[PDB]
Amino acid sequence: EKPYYDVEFNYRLDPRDGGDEVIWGGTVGLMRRKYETRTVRINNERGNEHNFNLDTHGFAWVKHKTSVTEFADYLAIRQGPYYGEVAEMLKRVTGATKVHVIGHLHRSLNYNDTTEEEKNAPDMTMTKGQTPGRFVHVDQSYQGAVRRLYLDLPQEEARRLEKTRWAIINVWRPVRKVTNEPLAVCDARSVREDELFNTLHLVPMRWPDAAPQENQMWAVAPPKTPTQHKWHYVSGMTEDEALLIKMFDSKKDGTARRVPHSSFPTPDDFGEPRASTETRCFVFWEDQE
Ligand SMILES: O=C(O)CNC(=O)C(=O)O
Numbered sequence: 001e002k003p004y005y006d007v008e009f010n011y012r013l014d015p016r017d018g019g020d021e022v023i024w025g026g027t028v029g030l031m032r033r034k035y036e037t038r039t040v041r042i043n044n045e046r047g048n049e050h051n052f053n054l055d056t057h058g059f060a061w062v063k064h065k066t067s068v069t070e071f072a073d074y075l076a077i078r079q080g081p082y083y084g085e086v087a088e089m090l091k092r093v094t095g096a097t098k099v100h101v102i103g104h105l106h107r108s109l110n111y112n113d114t115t116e117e118e119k120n121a122p123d124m125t126m127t128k129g130q131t132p133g134r135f136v137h138v139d140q141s142y143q144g145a146v147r148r149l150y151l152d153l154p155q156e157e158a159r160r161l162e163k164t165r166w167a168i169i170n171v172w173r174p175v176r177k178v179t180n181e182p183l184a185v186c187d188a189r190s191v192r193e194d195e196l197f198n199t200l201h202l203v204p205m206r207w208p209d210a211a212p213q214e215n216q217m218w219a220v221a222p223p224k225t226p227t228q229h230k231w232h233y234v235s236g237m238t239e240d241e242a243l244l245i246k247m248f249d250s251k252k253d254g255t256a257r258r259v260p261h262s263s264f265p266t267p268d269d270f271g272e273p274r275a276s277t278e279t280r281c282f283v284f285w286e287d288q289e
């Protein structure tokens with residue numbers, strides 16, 4: 001709960017320098033993926049949250065309370081009220097006409113310990129549980145956003161809702177007060193279009209009976225400067241708080257469209273491993289053409 005942190009971030013390593021362009025989600029090998037590392041400054045915004053919104057910067061920290069407390073049972077979450085409570089809040093915060101909550105991802109493993117525990121495991125093995133997303137990314141590219149819409153909605157509702165303004169937003173809530181590996185978000189205005197690279201993202205569920213689940217992300221080019229990209233986080237985020245992260249917005253002028261984000265360690269990290277859920281939401285404004 002210092003004013004800032006200077007931490008090494010993981011950015012896109014160009015293929016010319018040895019990089020690859022497949023993000024193997026949930027696998028051991030992704031933890032060994034190579035990156036272009038750069039030191040960036042992340043400003044603590046605890047107390048300054050009112051100066052950040054999804055329209056300008058693409059992200060927002062909100063006070064939102066929920067009755068749900070246990071998050072590691074995927075089935076119990078999907079069949080409980082959590083998705084509906086996220087919907088009501090997001091609809092209220094965004095003024096959306098309709099909110100579709102598609103799913104969530106639970107993270108609870110410590111990054112370093114998992115690297116150690118899995119150092120002899122084959123690349124394509126899938127960890128039991130999920131570690132922090134410790135690299136700069138946007139969960140959906142522009143192409144990936146369209147791909148998700150038609151994968152997560154019926155074909156005709158996806159075609160109807162594509163005719164009005166729609167957006168993808170992750171709602172990130174910790175299981176408890178964050179005392180290690182917080183979540184950094186990057187001002188959408190401070191990253192140019194030509195720094196974004198459509199990067200394919202695969203999860204080999206049910207292999208070999210099924211092709212790995214397909215997704216397309218933004219990878220982000222490294223900055224020349226610690227402050228070229230404008231990074232922010234909020235220290236001590238509690239389970240009563242939600243970090244909204246706009247991955248995509250169909251509206252090209254007048255609103256932020258994509259937020260690079262990444263978990264990061266601080267030297268003041270302590271306590272049992274950070275646990276969180278990020279719930280993926282489609283947001284629609286059927287008023288807006
Ligand atoms: O929590 C983490 O470590 C990473 N989370 C995300 O990237 C997200 O919510 O989209």
Ligand SMILES: [Cu+2]
Binds near residue numbers: 133137138139261
């Ligand atoms: Cu993410």
